[PDB]
């Protein structure tokens, strides 16, 4: 049991103070440390996960002045690989908590990289990944959504409107919240509210059809 707690907790105790930062050794050591903790965030024992959670948090707090863009590249890579659900969640909400710290010269390429991730994470059936994405979208879009174009936004809105028919109340809540927020943090808010109303009325407008209770509840 405890051996991997001693390993990650001593890796956390070390890397906050090792060597000089921005060196060619420290970039590698920090990559391996994030890879190790995000893996330990999905290990099969309770106190191991709680210690991995406080190891990621202490290391981000310690290195924000100096390695913020590398921390966000490591968290993004764990989102990109779409793995086990606690491993994905442990990266996703942390990336969303850091999203305001990216410099304006770095928002556009993260917008382009995250839409393939958000549109894969909305296709995950597990409700805890969805409750995490429901928190992440209103923070991600408030940090990147003015850097999107209209076709990129319409791809996100389509990916969440597809979920309004779901049997899970949580999936419908995640979609209903995400779609309105994606519009709200666009460069074109009044147009996107108009487009989203045309979709939402359009989904119930042929009022004689056998619409499902699930789709009505989402809309």
């Amino acid at each position: 049991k405890k051996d991997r707690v001693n390993h990650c907790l001593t890796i956390c105790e070390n890397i906050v103070a090792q060597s000089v930062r921005n060196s060619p050794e420290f970039q590698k050591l920090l990559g391996i440390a994030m890879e190790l903790f995000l893996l330990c965030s999905d290990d099969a024992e309770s106190d191991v996960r709680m210690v991995a959670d406080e190891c990621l948090n202490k290391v981000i707090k310690a290195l924000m002045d100096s390695n913020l863009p590398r921390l966000q590249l490591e968290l993004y890579k764990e989102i990109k690989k779409n793995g086990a659900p606690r491993s994905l969640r442990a990266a996703l909400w942390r990336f969303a908590e850091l999203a305001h710290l990216v410099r304006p010269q770095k928002c556009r390429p993260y917008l382009v990289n995250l839409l393939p991730c958000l549109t894969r994470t909305s296709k995950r059936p597990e409700e805890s990944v969805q409750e995490t994405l429901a928190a992440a979208v209103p923070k991600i879009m408030a940090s990147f959504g003015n850097f999107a174009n209209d076709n990129e936004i319409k791809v996100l809105l389509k990916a969440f409107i597809a979920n309004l028919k779901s049997s899970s109340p949580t999936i419908r809540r995640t979609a209903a919240g995400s779609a309105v927020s994606i519009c709200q943090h666009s460069r074109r808010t009044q147009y996107f509210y108009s487009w989203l109303l045309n979709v939402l009325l359009g989904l119930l407008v042929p009022v004689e059809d056998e619409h499902s209770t699930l789709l009505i509840l989402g809309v």
Partner: peptide, 17 residues
């Protein structure tokens, strides 16, 4: 981190004139 770190060249000095 910063643009002196990224450009790999030094910060200046504080002095009166």
């Amino acid at each position: 981190x910063d643009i002196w770190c990224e450009t790999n060249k030094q910060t200046g000095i504080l002095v009166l004139c």
